[PDB]
Design a protein around this ligand. Structure first.
Ligand code: ADP
Lengths: 135, 278, 327, 254, 123, 250
């Protein structure tokens, strides 16, 4: 087919988006928790913003990739809604993709994976609510 | 044979470009259709599964492939539904034509044969449909409400037919029986028309996590024994009686799809070559 | 420094090839459109995308395509004359002329001079023209029969057109109700083409059977003339007959039927009486053209025979193309 | 030892490669089927020259070094002692079943499942046949294809696609006789099949010798019932034996 | 583009160590001179640790941090700036315990912060 | 590893080319020698310089020359049968059979089956023999075959013309070797025999057409009958072959 652009299909597109989200997670993986390690942020001019906060990193992290930008838009949803847990979100979502990508290699369709993750989140919220402690 | 002059290369050039547009838009069929990523030239990126929006944002340059794009617009104006199913049907018929042309069958014989399957096809769908009363505002409410539940907003031809690709299986099943009574090249040309319809439910079964073969293979027996009520139910994730699930579509969508798709396949088949003017 | 800086000259060896390759290409371009089962064709001007269109009209294809070869421009201009003047036979003229040059290139390969070829084609065109004159059928009385012939001739002209689905000097809604202007424009063109030959049919009530009957009947008289003729003229006239027989061969090939079976059967038919057999595109076999109701005007087939022979005669007389330095 | 340069290929790429070899042996013999079959010019190792169309003699001289093709020759060695006549029909039918199987591998069917489908259809065909005996000229193959096609609808499992493929593969024998006779194969194929339903229910063959008409019963062309039963049985058994092989390992010389 | 893993810490060490090796001999009253080739072919024979690093171009951001911290020293204290970079480079030059022993930096940093409270008390 | 260690197998189009070129090559080898003005030819064996010789007999040319392809051996073996059994017409058999195969190669390119061509040649050989009994001879047989082409089914008509066209090439080659305009002499014989005058032929002495009955030139009936049959039969064998199986050399 002749077009004014470019196209690319297949399972490798899932892998390319998986390795991208996995890369963004590793940028904020070692900085998880109160003993997290600091990380440099070399801007375009030359300034170097050193910090360990995962939320501050993702606001300044600039990776020109669509899958990474989805997690950046995802960060704003968690920051505004609650204001914490953004680092665990990007790390949890990255492992679900790296594990789901392995299932896709075992001839497991993503629709069956999407259905499993939805039911797991429902039951997880149930088990969480059943094992709380009130204020 | 020598086959010095090779005008068939333009048929395979138009079929490949036509089949390419269908292969891309195939996965986005149904509620469980896999989304697709479109990136504008400026830098913006978007995600969607509506087949109509994807074809517009493809920038199709080939003439034969543009006929499928304009074909999808005709379905939107006439019926307004089944936009993605039309392009998938045309891509499979042309892919089936690639097997017939290798056997030494002419495009005109293939074109005239497909019209006979279309003529018998409309009779098959119209016979197994469910007539309704238009003045009865009860049927129109639940018909659009249940259909709108399949659309984005779920909270806020006087006939009907089942979904889940069941019209394509009854069409493919009885056309194979109709081809046994025919004579000449129309037999293989109509059988190939029947096998092409099976791409739709196998695509729905694939998107629903089921096996594409065993799903349509099981339904072809349920249609030989039962009726068109048997179709793929993605809400439950398996084969079920679609008449009970209240997942139906009007008759004009399935009829206009075969009508407009076959006319495009007949038009593409009649292309012997293209001339560049100035 | 004989011809440089734009100015070129093709010698006798190359100009003999360029003259035929240019003309034969235009014939093979639009031969697929011949017959009621003609193949469509896309036209897309370079540099612009809005010029897309699809058609199976041999006349419309030649009008829009540009031509740089002078040998091809002669054959194209001679075809546009048939479309503007007669309104029918634009495709048969281009195909019949090209098939003659295709066979002529095989004759010159046998060291047959072009002038020796032209002598045979002039004698064959007389015998071929005499065949239509004898087999032509006029209708002075029985206006019902003459009215029926106009209906058959109208269907032949309208064949392979947009409208194919549905007494003196010859100076909204679907098509059946006679949607946009493109439908009405092509409706006027093919319909005007029918009025041209139909008006010519009133001025000349003679009619001949189409579907390969007239083309095969003329080809038979040429083969008979090949029995009483000098040596080299026989081999040249034999190629004139084969060019006429290639017309129904193309009408059958475009329809998907076995052309070698149908066309060779018509030879055995016409060779032993039976000057009515032709191609039945409906069923895909041979049948009497009179019973099936297929017939064409005599002046149309006459001009198609003469314009095709006169066109090919000009190419053979050419042996060296001269191109000066373009400005 | 000698693991270097060892053959290593498996999956669909291996099965399709095996199917590619069997088709070459079938297509080579598909033209030599029937009385109008095209002869084969055989040159012996001693420099002799011979010409014939015997299916058995073609395979004995055909020294194909491919292993999958050797099994096709070993099959025909036994057929000469059981059937005698249709040695080309076995190889031509096996190549047809493997060619149609290639369309199923793309759909995602397992080779062992196709093997079970053909074994079920082969029993339907064998059951229907009793209903230089049965009527030759391809009448039996066309009648069996209709029965297998109808019974395929009564197979609710993935073998349904394989049963349909057995019907189309059965038609290659009559389609080959029409091609070798200089006629349109498909137009002559479907016309005889429609006559077996629309015109009259009894089976009718193909007029390959250009005699009066079809209905070989009038032409007195009749083959043995044991012949046809072993023909499609040996052909199916060879297809199952080839479909159940997905690795040809041979150590190379280092 | 970017750096990740053990290559970063070992890379920051070689950068800070390299900046200290320049001015190792610029300490004391018998300090050694340095030759700075200007882009125009000129030479400056200064022996000031602040002036040397000010004129040198550095690509690693770790070197920019070492130099920028030295400039902050000059504003507060115009002496002992050369000792800061040498000690910071020697404290980082012990890469045996850092990577070859596979100790985490938090283990090393806890020891360096414990010694600092002891170094202050002893002085 | 389908074929190795000397053994080989030729495909359809490969054996097609190898079958016709090998037979047609032997044809054009002896085409120049056909006629009283036959062109000489040199034969020089390998390793024996003294074996240099010159001749124009087609039988002497084929007996000594070696043959590698198997299809050519079939045509060369049948030529030796004509030399031993009959004793004359050896070059006519080899030239006529190759012209039949030269045309058959063209028909196969036109999507015409070899078996359909053999059906036409068998019918054409009947009308040709009937023309000899009623009765230069090469054009009489071609005239009857051309008339038979108008009384035959579709595809068989085209095969009959190639059979007549091959017979017409014999006087063409006889005239070409003599240096005369073969296109005029042969086309004049065709125009003659088509309307009476079943005794016309070539006059190599004067270089024109003359009455063979008056000039006193004639050939035996049994010789021409065997030349027609041995050529069509030999061409039938090559045309019927579609695959060549080469075995390992010993
Ligand atoms: N006369 C001296 N004898 C021994 N050591 C000295 C002497 N003068 C300076 N030093 C040492 O040199 C170091 C650097 O001194 P100074 O040049 O004043 O600071 P900076 O090198 O940062 O400019 C001091 O730590 C001091 O111990």
């Amino acid at each position: 087919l002749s077009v004014f652009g470019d196209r690319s299909t297949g399972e490798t597109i899932r892998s390319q988006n998986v390795m991208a989200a996995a890369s963004i997670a590793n940028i904020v993986k070692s900085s998880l928790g109160p003993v997290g390690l600091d990380k440099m942020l070399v801007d375009d001019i030359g300034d170097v913003t050193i910090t360990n906060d995962g939320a501050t990193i993702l606001k300044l992290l600039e990776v020109e990739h669509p899958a990474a930008k989805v997690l950046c838009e995802l960060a704003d949803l968690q920051d505004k809604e609650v204001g914490d847990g953004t680092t665990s979100v990007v790390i949890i979502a990255a492992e679900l993709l790296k594990n789901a990508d392995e299932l896709v290699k075992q001839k497991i369709h993503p629709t069956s994976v999407i259905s499993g993750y939805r039911l797991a989140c429902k039951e997880a919220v149930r088990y969480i609510n059943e094992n709380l402690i009130v204020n | 044979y020598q086959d010095r002059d090779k005008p068939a290369q333009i048929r395979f050039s138009n079929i490949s470009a036509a089949k390419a547009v269908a292969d891309a838009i195939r996965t986005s069929l149904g509620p469980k259709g896999m989304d697709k990523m479109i990136q504008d030239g400026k830098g913006d990126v978007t995600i969607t599964n509506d087949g109509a929006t994807i074809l517009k944002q493809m920038q199709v340059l080939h003439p034969a492939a543009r006929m499928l794009v304009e074909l999808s617009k005709a379905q939107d104006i006439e019926a307004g539904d089944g936009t993605t199913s039309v392009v998938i049907i045309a891509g499979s018929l042309l892919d089936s034509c690639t097997k017939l042309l290798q056997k030494g069958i002419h495009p005109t014989i293939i074109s005239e044969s497909f019209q006979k399957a279309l003529e018998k096809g409309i009779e098959i769908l119209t016979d197994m449909s469910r007539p309704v009363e238009l003045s009865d505002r009860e049927t129109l409410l639940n018909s659009a409400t249940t259909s709108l539940n399949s659309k984005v907003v779920s909270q806020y031809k006087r006939a009907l037919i089942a979904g889940g690709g069941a019209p394509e299986i009854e069409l493919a099943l009885r056309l194979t029986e109709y081809s046994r009574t025919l004579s000449g090249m129309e037999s293989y040309c109509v059988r190939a028309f029947a096998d092409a319809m099976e791409v739709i439910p196998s695509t729905l079964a694939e998107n629903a996590g089921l096996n594409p073969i065993s799903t349509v293979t099981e339904l072809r027996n349920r249609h030989a024994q039962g009726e068109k009520t048997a179709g793929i139910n993605v809400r439950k994730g398996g084969i079920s009686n679609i008449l009970e699930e209240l997942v139906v579509q009007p008759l004009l969508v399935s009829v206009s799809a075969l009508t407009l798709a076959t006319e495009t396949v007949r038009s593409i088949l009649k292309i012997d070559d293209v001339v560049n003017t100035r | 420094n004989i011809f440089k800086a734009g100015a070129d000259e093709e010698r006798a060896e190359t100009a003999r090839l360029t003259s035929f390759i240019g003309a034969i290409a235009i014939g093979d371009l639009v031969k697929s459109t011949l017959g009621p089962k003609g193949m469509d064709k896309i036209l897309l001007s370079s540099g612009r995308d809005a010029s897309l269109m699809v058609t199976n009209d041999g006349a419309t294809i030649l009008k829009n395509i540009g031509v740089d070869n002078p040998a091809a421009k002669v054959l194209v201009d001679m075809s546009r004359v048939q479309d503007d003047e007669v309104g029918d036979g634009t495709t048969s003229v281009t195909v019949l002329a090209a098939e003659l040059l295709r066979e002529a290139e095989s004759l010159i390969a046998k060291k047959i001079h072009p002038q020796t070829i032209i002598a045979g084609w002039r004698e064959a065109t007389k015998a071929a023209r005499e065949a239509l004159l004898s087999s032509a059928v006029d209708h002075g009385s029985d206006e019902v029969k003459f009215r029926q012939d106009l209906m058959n001739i109208a269907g032949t002209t309208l064949s392979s057109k947009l409208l194919t689905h549905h007494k003196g000097s010859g100076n909204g809604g679907s098509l059946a109700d006679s949607a946009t202007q493109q439908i009405l424009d092509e409706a006027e063109r093919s319909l005007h083409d029918a009025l041209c030959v139909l008006a010519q049919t009133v001025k000349d009530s003679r009619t001949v059977y189409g579907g390969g009957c007239s083309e095969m009947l003329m080809a038979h008289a040429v083969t008979q003339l090949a029995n009483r003729t000098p040596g080299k003229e026989a081999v040249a006239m034999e190629s004139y007959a084969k060019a006429l027989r290639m017309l129904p061969t193309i009408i059958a090939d475009n329809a998907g039927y076995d052309s070698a079976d149908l066309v060779a059967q018509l030879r055995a038919a016409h060779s032993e009486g039976n000057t009515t057999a032709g191609l039945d595109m409906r069923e895909g076999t041979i049948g009497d053209m009179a019973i099936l109701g297929i017939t064409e005007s005599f002046q149309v087939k006459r001009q198609v025979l003469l314009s095709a022979a006169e066109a090919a005669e000009v190419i053979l007389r050419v042996d060296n193309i001269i191109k000066a330095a373009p400005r | 030892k000698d693991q270097d340069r060892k053959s290593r290929l498996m999956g669909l790429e291996a099965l399709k490669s095996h199917i590619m070899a069997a088709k070459a042996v079938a297509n080579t013999m598909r033209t030599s089927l029937g009385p109008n079959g095209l002869d084969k010019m055989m040159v012996d190792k001693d420099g002799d020259v011979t010409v014939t169309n015997d299916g058995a003699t073609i395979l004995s001289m055909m020294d194909v070094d491919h292993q999958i093709a050797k099994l096709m020759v070993e099959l025909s060695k036994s057929q000469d002692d059981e059937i005698g006549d249709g040695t080309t029909g076995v190889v031509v039918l096996a190549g047809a079943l493997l060619e149609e199987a290639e369309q199923l591998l793309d759909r995602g069917i397992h080779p062992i499942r196709i093997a079970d489908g053909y074994e079920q259809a082969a029993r339907v065909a064998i059951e229907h046949l009793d209903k230089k005996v049965v009527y030759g000229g391809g009448a039996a193959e066309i009648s069996c294809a209709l029965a297998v096609s109808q019974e395929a609808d009564k197979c609710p499992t993935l073998e349904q696609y394989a049963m349909r493929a057995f019907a189309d593969a059965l038609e290659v024998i009559p389609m080959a006789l029409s091609e070798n006779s200089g006629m349109n194969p498909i137009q002559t194929m479907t016309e005889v099949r429609a006559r077996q339903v629309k015109e009259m229910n009894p089976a009718l063959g193909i007029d390959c010798l250009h005699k009066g008409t079809n209905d070989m019963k009038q032409q007195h062309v009749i083959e043995t019932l044991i012949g046809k039963k072993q023909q499609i049985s040996l052909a199916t058994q060879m297809v199952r034996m080839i479909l159940k092989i997905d690795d040809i390992r041979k150590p190379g010389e280092s | 583009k970017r750096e990740s893993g053990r290559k970063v810490q070992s890379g920051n060490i070689n950068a800070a160590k390299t900046i200290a090796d320049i001015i190792r001999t610029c300490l004391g009253p018998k300090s050694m001179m340095k030759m700075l080739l200007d882009p125009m072919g000129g030479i400056v024979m200064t022996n000031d640790g602040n002036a040397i690093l000010r004129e040198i171009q550095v690509q690693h951001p770790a070197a920019k941090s070492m130099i920028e911290i030295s400039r902050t020293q000059d504003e507060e204290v115009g002496d002992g700036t050369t000792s800061v970079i040498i000690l910071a480079g020697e404290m980082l030059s012990v890469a045996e315990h850092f990577l070859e022993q596979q100790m985490h930096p938090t283990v090393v940093i806890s020891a360096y912060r414990k010694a600092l409270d002891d170094m202050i008390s002893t002085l």
